[PDB]
Design a protein around this nucleic acid. Structure first.
Ligand SMILES: [Zn+2]
Ligand SMILES: [Zn+2]
Ligand SMILES: [Zn+2]
Ligand SMILES: [Zn+2]
Lengths: 234, 234, 234, 234
DNA sequence: TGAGACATGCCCAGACATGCCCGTTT
DNA sequence: ACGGGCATGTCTGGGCATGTCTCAAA
């Protein structure tokens, strides 16, 4: 009964931004990101890899926090949590509170929090600089409830806020992305990307023919990306 | 679940990288390598020769370590081990623990590790310079479970990470290859290479809507470039 | 798992059997019965009237009990209950425990049981003779979960067992009907009845080899008899 | 590996024998009995209902024991048990030892035994007379390994022996059925019934034509049952 | 000795299933 | 109070996956 956490995309001072691995679309992928909608479509309880990129490595003692909130204005004040059924569904990982939606894996330094005032749920981990001969970091998340579970998110879309903060809890950078947990991310991704391209499709669009869906896949990606760089100028 | 070791290729100061033989003489039925897929196909517990290349002789006490990790994101955090059935088998050489999938053959200096923190398994041997007259060092491996063993890999593909490290365990170099342990390497290699070919020789055409004049020309010469590379056969 | 109560129809000494109304006047959208399937389609928590027929008046202290069991063999041993979500709801009348799926409506004599040994739920009411001028007694039920509730019936079909018993619980009679609790009884009833029709509107012939004149005799007759039933209603 | 428990059918003084439910072969079925083969096809850990018939009630304290043995003479002396993988999993059931293949569902009076001399496993339950209106009693079993699990049954066919015995453990009756635990009961059942069919078919046969695939399969099952009863006369 | 021919657990694109929203209707 | 569209978790037919058996042949 306090307030909603900030979601303003703060690039930061270290050039903090997130990156996602490219996936297919056929019903087989337990996870697939949409650059066009900035939406991660994933299946229930399946590890989702998320990359962290930085210009200059932050100072030791920096951490990364993850939190979910309802993307719809009227529901934004409601604490996002697991439904009654899955709340009872005991998972092997006893390190993460059974009521939490977002979990981190492969990191024993992960700390799960329940704000003493806002009652919001979140998870935190230290910030590891890229590996010797690498270029980014990666944290593996898992979502323990479907977006449709009654008594839970009940068909309401959520947003995952990833904040880069220091030992105090000061803001050093913030990124975010919408998430949809569902049984068929491939199918569901297509449908939304289509309704997106079901409007604003008129004007001066030059047609181009491509051979193979694989090649077509690449060209579409690289092109829907350039339709964002220009969109950002708004 | 446990933290995932990096798999990013890194040649390092010594230009470290792997090489494989072109199996097609006698023992080319028990073990075969696919350059197109960068995947080794081999039978259970059969010798697998791997070549180590290095530009300059590494420092005294350099070691070579081999570790397997699941290739798919939803399984990356799970430790790769032998299934309960083969674990209680009597194929152990005495030097290698029964739970390890990967063994080194023909080297009594091989050491086996059960990471006390990540619980990951690995085998390590001291680095040895190439034999006089050659520019590579050969290391022989054996994989103790089929990729299909239930209770074990359970049909999940794996990636083998080979790292070059100093006497203290610091990374000097890294490379990797995919491995499928099966009863019919030849047949399975043919199948997978054919499925990869079909995905490249896809004649179905799809149209793309560009949103710019010059932007269109970018994809133009780019797509025609590819459409000309396909003339390699045509 | 728990022992499965019998579901075999048994009229007993009193010629006990159930009867349902032909919904098609006003409230025929919230609850409809299919004679062809012997299945009741009704909305969550909406009144379901059932008729009790008996040839001679049962003895003093006769009771009527209702219990649900899963219809499929792989689920028969699992107790039918309300899902966690609706269980914590505030729809309880005070008389019925929150975990019971089946409630009796309009009768403060209704009693609710949680079998201490089989853990099965059931509701019981005293037997009451038909109203003057009628030959049946009406009992009203309400089903507190959709057949689709996860954590509960989870899309598994159920069978409702109605038993007539003496003051001590001995079986005097038994009958039953299938129940699907859904949001659209009409639509779902149409769908299922159509799917049943197609399974009979199948005119594919097959030939059977029978050994022995008397056996052929038996089969021929059993077959020519089923033919009548087929053209019996066109 | 010494002796072998008898598998000879014996109705005894109470006319003891087994009955089974009638099922189709669609992919939807998790359990299906074949009369022509007297073989039960069921999926891993799924409920298998077995009916028990008797001509006259047995004495007080009578029990029913189930035990599995390998059908092929060259494996009969080997005890049937769970493979290393499934054994290594303490299933929710806290009454049955983890190494027992056969379990009984819904019966707290069930007792599991490890014979001190033969080392054979068996599960025993008290004989319960049918309820009023019923002609049989049913017991619900669960088989905890696939017939193909390596390290266990390893593709070897097994037979289940059901014996009726008095409070002192003396043989009152015996019957049996072959069991195949697999991922696709319907498919495998169809396959084996087809192999039997295209074999013993020869001689004088009357022809009957039937309309409808299901009616035909029902008639064919009835006819195959009678034909099995023929080959068991001489 | 190796390539068909089985044997047998799993996968998946395309329905099907099923609670809700919504504007028209008795 | 009713069909028609959506929204979405689940099902399945045909095929794929994959260890094992086999018989004729370098
Ligand atoms: Zn949930
Ligand atoms: Zn194995
Ligand atoms: Zn419910
Ligand atoms: Zn097993």
């Amino acid at each position: 009964s306090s307030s909603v956490p900030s979601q303003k995309t703060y690039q930061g001072s270290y050039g903090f931004r997130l990156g996602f691995l490219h996936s297919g679309t056929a019903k087989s992928v337990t996870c697939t990101y949409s650059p066009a909608l900035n939406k991660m479509f994933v299946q229930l309880a399946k590890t989702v890899p998320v990359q962290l990129y930085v210009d200059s490595t932050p100072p030791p003692g920096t951490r990364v926090r993850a939190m979910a909130i309802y993307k719809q204005s009227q529901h934004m004040t409601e604490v996002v949590r697991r439904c009654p059924h899955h709340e009872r569904s005991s998972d092997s990982d006893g390190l993460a509170p059974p009521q939490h939606l977002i979990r981190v894996e492969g990191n024993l330094r992960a700390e799960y929090l329940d704000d003493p005032n806002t009652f919001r749920h979140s998870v935190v981990v230290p910030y590891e600089p890229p590996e010797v001969g690498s270029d980014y970091t990666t944290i593996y998340f898992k979502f323990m409830c479907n977006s449709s579970c009654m008594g839970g998110m009940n068909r309401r879309p959520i947003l995952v806020i990833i904040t880069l903060e220091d030992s105090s809890g000061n803001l050093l950078g913030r990124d975010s992305f919408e998430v949809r947990v569902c049984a068929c991310p491939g199918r569901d991704r297509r449908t939304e990307e289509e309704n997106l391209r079901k409007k604003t499709m008129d004007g001066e669009y030059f047609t181009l023919q491509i051979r193979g869906r694989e090649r077509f896949e690449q060209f579409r990606e690289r092109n829907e990306a350039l339709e964002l760089k220009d969109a950002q100028a708004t």
